Structure formats: structure tokens, C-alpha cells
């Protein structure tokens, strides 16, 4: 599994982005997938997760009502719609593919990772 | 004399032997003293009228049975026991109620006492429709199911039998206890897997009822048709297969 993120960029507070994570090589249609983020001097933190059987979603408390995770198996891509962005959303956002059934919140339990895409929200 | 079948033969020895068996093999519960567990179980219903059992009667047992399970990997189920349990044998980080110590002790068993004796009634025990709802068996399952459902977080999964009339039954343990104890402060989504017996069953009126019950608690709902239970177990085991 090779993962590649795109869709990041520079926006004003209140703005929107749509991140996508496209899989080359092996399909990930039967893996749970998650978006994580990492601000300059901090540890990776869970943003959102999605299962593979029924594509059920899961969000960090800071993401609820603002971000939407989704996937499209045919395209081999996971999406993160981000609305109402704030400066403290500024970070490198990465997608990860896990194993088993559920999308957990612990980065070290995910096997495959992309390089990430920069998200910068100005004040 | 009650309408239901009596306490299962050799119930004391069976419960004790299940405790010994579970605790000696599952390392997370090795600390448990199985004699204490039995004494606490027995104390819940012995010398008590079997129509006046409360959850508090089972509290000492609940406490000995304390088990810190991963909240995010719970599989609930309804009228599809064998497949739900096969599933947790394949996807071994997930569990059903009956994969916990307390669920494992009581599974498929029946028990009650009498108000005027310290004896176990092997002749008959209350039937929940015909005699009384608040009997030793019903109250146990109601207590442990409620607590199990309260422990759940993140995405909770439920397996349902799609071959039967009332795929979701609001009068089942899942329908009347478990679903109303999923806390919205930590459960974000219930995912239903409707198992087929050889159409789109997620459209069935009873699934819409479940969706509605769940929506009102501010929890999201997903539903999935499992057409081929055999392929499903195979693909969960090895998702790298090109057939999935």
C-alpha cells in the first residue's frame, strides 16, 4: 500500500478544504482508514476514522460537526472535508491504513502511511 | 410452581467450572477467585423470592467480574448467536458479552431460588411473560447487558438475523436494553450487519425503526447487507484476497 495525500493549502479562518488520500499499488477497500494530524512541535493526533465493512465514521472531539471523512472504494481514495477551519487546525494531515475491523485512535497501530499534506489557516 | 424450566442440572459445579476454565486461560482475569465469584452469584438469588430480584442483588458479582474491555471493539448481536461468536473467534480483538467472564459464566443456563429456603429450585423457575419479569435470569442479563452497552464507545457493531420476521425486535434484549444504553457522549456510530439465509434488507421497516431509535440518541447509523456469511468470515480473516 502506497498512500498519497493532496488537497491541502492556505486558507483564511472560516474557510474550507477537501483533503484526499489516493492509494496506488494494492487496494485498501478492506482496511480501516484514518486521518491524523501533526502540528510543528507536537505528536500526531487522531482526526477521523472510517471502517471498511459498512464505512462507519468516527471523529475527534475537535472535528465533530466540522469535518467529514468518507471513502470511495472504486477510486481507492479517502476524503476529509474540512469546514469552519481555525488557526489551531494548522498542521500536516496524513492518512493511514490499518488492519482488522475498527479505526482506532492510536497512530502506532496503523501499518501504512502517506507523507502528508500541509494545512495552514491564517488568522 | 412456575411455568419456566427449572435450574440447569449441576448449575453450581457448572458455573464454578466455567469460572475456573475462563480464569486459568484468559490472563486478564487470572486474579479472580472463582469461589468468591460463585458465593457472590449464589448470594444474588438464594433465599429470595424469584420475582423480586434487583440489579443491586448482582452488584457484588459485577464487582468481582470487573473487566476493562476495549470500548471501541464491541460486537452486539441479536438472535444470531453462533455466527456472532464465530466472528469474534476470527477477529480476535473484538468481543461479545459472552466473551467476557460474566457473560461466559451464565450463557445458556437457568437458575432460581425460593423465598423460604436456601435451596436451588431445579423443578421450575419463572417465565418472564407468564410469571414475572424480575427473575434471577432476566435480571442478570438485563444488568450485564446494560453495563456492557454503557461501556461501548466509538463505532459499536451489531449483528442481526436477516432471515427472520423482525430483523430488529424492539422487545429483544438488544432492542429494549442495549440500544437505549449506548451513551452519545462516547458512541458515535452503530453499524448493523444484517446476515442473510439465501434483496436489500437495510430497507426493512424494522431497520428504519432501529435507525430512528439511534438518531434520537444523537448517534449515527450505518447498515450493511452480509449476503454470504462464509465469504465475509474469509475476507475478515484475509482481506488481501482478490475475491473481496
List keywords for this structure.
heterodimer; A: 123 residues; mainly beta; Immunoglobulin-like; seven-stranded mixed beta sheet; four-stranded antiparallel beta sheet; 0% helix; B: 244 residues; alpha/beta; ADP Ribosyl Cyclase, Chain A, domain 1; Rossmann fold; 2 domains; four-stranded parallel beta sheet; two-stranded antiparallel ribbon; 38% helix; 13% strand; hydrolase/immune system
Structural description of this entry:
The complex is a heterodimer of chains A (123) and B (244). Chain A is mainly beta and 123 residues long. Chain A has a single domain (1-123), classed as Sandwich (Immunoglobulin-like), CATH 2.60.40. Chain A is 0% helix and 48% strand. Chain A is built from no helices and eleven strands. In chain A, strands 2, 4, 5, 6, 9, 10 and 11 form a seven-stranded mixed β-sheet that branches. A four-stranded antiparallel β-sheet of chain A has the order 1-3-8-7, with no helix packed on it. With 244 residues, chain B is of the alpha/beta class. Chain B is 38% helix and 13% strand. Chain B has helices at residues 11-25, 34-45, 59-64, 81-90, 101-106, 136-151, 173-178, 205-216, 229-237, and strands spanning 4-5, 75-78, 124-125, 154-161, 187-195, 220-226. In chain B, the strands form two sheets. Chain B has a four-stranded parallel β-sheet, with helices on both faces. In chain B, strands 1-3 form a two-stranded antiparallel sheet. Chain B is globular, with a radius of gyration of 19 Å. The chains are: A mainly beta (123), B alpha/beta (244). Chain A binds chain B through residues 26, 29-31, 49, 51-59, 99-105, and chain B through 72-73, 91, 93-94, 154-155, 157, 188-189, 191-193, 220, 222-224, 235-236, 239-240, 244. Chain B: It is a single-pass type II membrane protein. Chain B: Its EC number is 3.2.2.-, 3.2.2.6, 2.4.99.20. Chain B: Homodimer.
Amino acid at each position: 500500500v502506497q498512500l498519497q495525500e493532496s488537497g491541502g493549502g492556505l486558507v483564511q479562518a472560516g474557510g474550507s478544504l477537501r483533503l484526499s488520500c489516493t492509494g496506488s499499488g494494492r487496494t485498501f477497500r478492506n482496511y480501516p482508514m484514518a486521518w491524523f494530524r501533526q502540528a510543528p512541535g507536537k505528536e500526531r493526533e487522531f482526526v477521523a476514522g472510517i471502517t471498511w465493512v459498512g464505512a462507519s465514521t468516527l471523529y475527534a472531539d475537535f472535528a465533530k460537526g466540522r469535518f467529514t471523512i468518507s471513502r470511495d472504494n472504486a477510486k481507492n481514495t479517502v476524503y476529509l472535508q474540512m469546514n469552519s477551519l481555525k488557526p489551531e487546525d494548522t498542521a500536516v494531515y496524513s492518512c493511514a491504513a490499518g488492519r482488522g475491523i475498527v479505526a482506532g485512535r492510536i497512530p502506532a497501530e496503523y501499518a501504512d502511511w502517506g507523507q502528508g499534506t500541509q494545512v495552514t489557516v491564517s488568522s | 410452581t412456575w411455568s419456566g424450566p427449572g435450574t440447569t442440572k449441576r448449575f453450581p459445579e457448572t458455573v464454578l467450572a466455567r469460572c475456573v476454565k475462563y480464569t486459568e486461560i484468559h490472563p486478564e482475569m487470572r486474579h479472580v477467585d472463582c469461589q468468591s465469584v460463585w458465593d457472590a452469584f449464589k448470594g444474588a438469588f438464594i433465599s429470595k423470592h424469584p420475582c423480586d430480584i434487583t440489579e443491586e442483588d448482582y452488584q457484588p458479582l459485577m464487582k468481582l467480574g470487573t473487566q476493562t474491555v476495549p470500548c471501541n471493539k464491541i460486537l452486539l448481536w441479536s438472535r444470531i448467536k453462533d455466527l456472532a461468536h464465530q466472528f469474534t473467534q476470527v477477529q480476535r480483538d473484538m468481543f461479545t458479552l459472552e466473551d467476557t467472564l460474566l457473560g461466559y459464566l451464565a450463557d445458556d443456563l437457568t437458575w432460581c431460588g425460593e423465598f423460604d429456603t436456601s435451596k436451588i429450585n431445579y423443578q421450575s423457575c419463572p417465565d418472564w411473560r407468564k410469571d414475572c419479569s424480575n427473575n434471577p435470569v432476566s435480571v442478570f442479563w438485563k444488568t450485564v447487558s446494560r453495563r456492557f452497552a454503557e461501556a461501548a464507545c466509538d463505532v459499536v457493531h451489531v449483528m442481526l438475523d436477516g432471515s427472520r420476521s423482525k430483523i430488529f425486535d424492539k422487545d429483544s434484549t438488544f432492542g429494549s436494553v442495549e440500544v437505549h444504553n449506548l451513551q452519545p457522549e462516547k458512541v458515535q456510530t452503530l453499524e448493523a450487519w444484517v446476515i442473510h439465509g439465501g434483496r436489500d434488507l437495510c430497507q426493512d421497516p424494522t431497520i428504519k425503526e432501529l435507525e430512528s431509535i439511534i438518531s434520537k440518541r444523537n448517534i449515527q447509523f450505518s447498515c450493511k447487507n452480509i449476503y454470504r456469511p462464509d465469504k465475509f468470515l474469509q475476507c475478515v480473516k484475509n482481506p488481501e484476497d482478490s475475491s473481496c
